C-alpha cells in the first residue's frame, strides 16, 4: 500500500516539519514546545495538501499512515485532534483532508486514496448534518450532532464533490455582511459569534466559501477590504463590530494567505499583489510562537499557482 515514489519539487518545508513542528510519535504540533500541545486534524490536513502541491508522494503516505493510527475512528470519523478523550470530528477539517486524498489519488495515480476519501466523506455528509444541512460536528461516542454551523467550516468544493443537497448550500446563499458576515447559522438564523469582535480568519474562510457558491463576492465585506487596504495598507487580524476598527494593531499571516488567494480568485490583481508582499512580509520563522496553521498556510500559499519573461 504505497505510492510510486515522486521526486518532490522542494523538500525545505519537509524538512524544516520534521525539525521544528514533529512530536516523538510523528504528529505535527501547533507550537514548537509548547504547554498545551494541541496534535489537530486541521494541521495534518493542511500538511497533506502541502505535499500534494509539491509532488511528495513519500511523505504524503507517511502522513495518510498517521492519519489512519491517530485521528480515523473504527467507523471512520477523523477525531479533530489526535487523543483519547476526543469526541467529535469537525467538518473543515474532514474536507480539507478527503480534499488533499482526492488531489492525491490523481497526483500520485493512486486509486486507493480516492476511495478512503469517499467512505470517509460519504460518513461526514451521513452524520454531521441535520437534515441534509452540514452542522460543524457529530459526537460520535455520544452520538449527537452539533446545534451550530459555522460558516467558515464550508469547503464548497468538497461540498460538491459528495453531492449535498440544494438546501445544504441556503446558509452560504442567503447570509449577509454588513460590513461583516454573521459567522453562525443555528435554528434556522443567523448569530454572530461574538458580542463585538470579529476574527478576520473566519471572515475570510467565510468570504470565499460565499464567492464559490454564489460567484459573486458579497459586496459589503469587499468594500471593507478594500478600503482598509487603500486606507492602511493592511488588512488587520481582528476588528471590533461596533466600530469596525481593529481591535489591535495585530497583523495574521492566515489573513493575508487567503486575502491572497481571494483576490486571485476573484480577479482582483493588484490587490493580490499587495496582500502577496504582505504575507511575505509576515515572520513565520519561529515554530515556538507561529502556530503551525500561520506556518503552512504561507507555505501552502506562496507555492500555489514559467511566465517571469514572458508569458
Not at 480515523?72 to 477539517?93: G, P
Not at 466523506?121 to 441534509?132: D, I, P
Not at 478576520?200 to 471593507?224: K, S, T
Amino acid at each position: 500500500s504505497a505510492p510510486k515514489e515522486t521526486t518532490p519539487t522542494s523538500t525545505s518545508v519537509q524538512t524544516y516539519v520534521k525539525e521544528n513542528y514533529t512530536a516523538k510519535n510523528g504528529l505535527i504540533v501547533d507550537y514548537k514546545n509548547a504547554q498545551e500541545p494541541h496534535y489537530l486534524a486541521e494541521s495534518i490536513g493542511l500538511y497533506m495538501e502541502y505535499l500534494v502541491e509539491v509532488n511528495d508522494s513519500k511523505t504524503f503516505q507517511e502522513q495518510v499512515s498517521h492519519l489512519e493510527k491517530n485521528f480515523i475512528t473504527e467507523d471512520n470519523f477523523i477525531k479533530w485532534e489526535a487523543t483519547d478523550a476526543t469526541t467529535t470530528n469537525a467538518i473543515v477539517d474532514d474536507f480539507r483532508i478527503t480534499e488533499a486524498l482526492y488531489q492525491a489519488s490523481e497526483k500520485f495515480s493512486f486509486p486507493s486514496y480516492k476511495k478512503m476519501a469517499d467512505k470517509i466523506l460519504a460518513n461526514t455528509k451521513k452524520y454531521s448534518a441535520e437534515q441534509g444541512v452540514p452542522v460543524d460536528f457529530y459526537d460520535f461516542v455520544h452520538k449527537k450532532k452539533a446545534d451550530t454551523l459555522h460558516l467558515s467550516y464550508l469547503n464548497i468544493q468538497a461540498m460538491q464533490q459528495i453531492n449535498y443537497r440544494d438546501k445544504a448550500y441556503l446558509p452560504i446563499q442567503t447570509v449577509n455582511a454588513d460590513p461583516f458576515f454573521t459567522e453562525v447559522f443555528q435554528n434556522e438564523q443567523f448569530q454572530y459569534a461574538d458580542p463585538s469582535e470579529v476574527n478576520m480568519i473566519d471572515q475570510m474562510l467565510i468570504a470565499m466559501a460565499y464567492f464559490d457558491e454564489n460567484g459573486d463576492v458579497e459586496p459589503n465585506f469587499d468594500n471593507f477590504l478594500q478600503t482598509e487596504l487603500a486606507s492602511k495598507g493592511k488588512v488587520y487580524a481582528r476588528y471590533q463590530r461596533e466600530t469596525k476598527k481593529p481591535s489591535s494593531e495585530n497583523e495574521s499571516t492566515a489573513v493575508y494567505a487567503f486575502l491572497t488567494q481571494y483576490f486571485n480568485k476573484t480577479n482582483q490583481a493588484k490587490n493580490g499583489k499587495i496582500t502577496k508582499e504582505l504575507l511575505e512580509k509576515m515572520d513565520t520563522s519561529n515554530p515556538e510562537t507561529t502556530h503551525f496553521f500561520d506556518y503552512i498556510n504561507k507555505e501552502i500559499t506562496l507555492k500555489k499557482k514559467h511566465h517571469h519573461h514572458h508569458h
